[PDB]
Amino acid sequence: GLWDPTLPMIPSANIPGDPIAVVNQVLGISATSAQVTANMGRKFLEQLGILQPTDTGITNAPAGSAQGRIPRVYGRQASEYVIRRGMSQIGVPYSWGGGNAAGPSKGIDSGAGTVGFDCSGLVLYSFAGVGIKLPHYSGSQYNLGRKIPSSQMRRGDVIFYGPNGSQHVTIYLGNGQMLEAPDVGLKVRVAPVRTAGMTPYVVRYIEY
């Protein structure tokens, strides 16, 4: 069928726009995922020695393009930083609708009382570290980046499930393993790649 039958066979949480990501009620400040992501992207570009005045920090490339703001010679470094961000969240609770560019957050519905990540929240959190700003919905994430045949997926590519990638999303680690925020009551985990429900393409956000 069209779905990974180990997970709920429904579209993933679809949270619109540019959510508030950081709140400090003592200082009186708040800022959105796009603001936090831009900040991280500028820092990353500055650490590569390439920050320019025209850089907002959002390092997004046009959907389908094989060229982006992060130079190819630095793409492995960028991918490894994204993977280390994601892996640092191993053990954080799953929460449906949870997560933003700054970390786990309260979800919606089954995730309303849990600070955690859902599938697309973990992906967006991870990639935010290098300025790549992703929407909080797996199906919208599936329409960005560049498609790679699933048979040719590589470490750092992003695996999708369900029609239009709507059900679930994970980060491929190589060697048949993936990082994911799986389902209610579980934790961010490494698990074997599942092929049931997998789309015929993975998405590459960082070229190298």
CATH of the domain at 200: 3.90.1720.10
33 closest CA partner among 6, 15, 53: 15
* 161 in Cβ contact with 199 (< 8 Å): yes
Q: 3-state secondary structure string, the chain? A: CCCCCCCCCCCCCCECCCCEEEEECCCCEEEEHHHHHHHHHHHHHHHCCCCCCCCCCCCCCCCCCCCCCCCHHHHHHHHHHHHHHHHCCCCCEECCCCCECCECEECCHHHCCCEEECHHHHHHHHHHCCCCCCCECHHHHCCCCEEEEHHHCCCCCEEEECHHHCCEEEEEEECCEEEECCCCCCECEEEECCCCCECCEEEECCCC
Experimental method: X-ray
User: Is 136 marked active-site?
Assistant: no
Q: How many domains does the chain have?
A: 1
Tokens of residue 159, six digits:
């695996």
Quote the domain boundaries for residue 170. 1-208
Known catalytic residue at 207: no
Alpha-carbon torsion angle 124, 126, 130, 136, nearest 10:
0
d(CA 36, CA 179): 23
Integer Cα distance of 199 and 147 in angstroms: 11
- Given phi > 0 = left and psi -120 to 50 = alpha, else beta, which region is 95? beta
Give burial (CB, 10 Å; 0-12/13-18/19+) of 67: exposed
**CA-derived radius of gyration, the chain:** 16
Q: Please name every residue paired with 94 in a beta bridge, in sequence order, or none if there are none.
A: 117
Q: Which of 46, 80, 136, 180 is catalytic?
A: 180
Give the pairing type, strands 201-204 and 146-149: antiparallel
Active-site residue, 168 included: yes
CA dist 161 and 195 (Å) reads 9
C-alpha 132: how far from its chain's center? 9
Alpha carbons 153 and 137: distance in angstroms, whole number: 21
CA-CA distance, 80 to 16, in Å (whole number)? 28
* Distance between CA atoms of residues 175 and 193, nearest Å: 9
Residue type, 170: T
Alpha-carbon gap, residue 137 to 12, rounded angstroms: 7
Q: How many Å apart are CA 40 and CA 43, to the nearest integer? A: 5
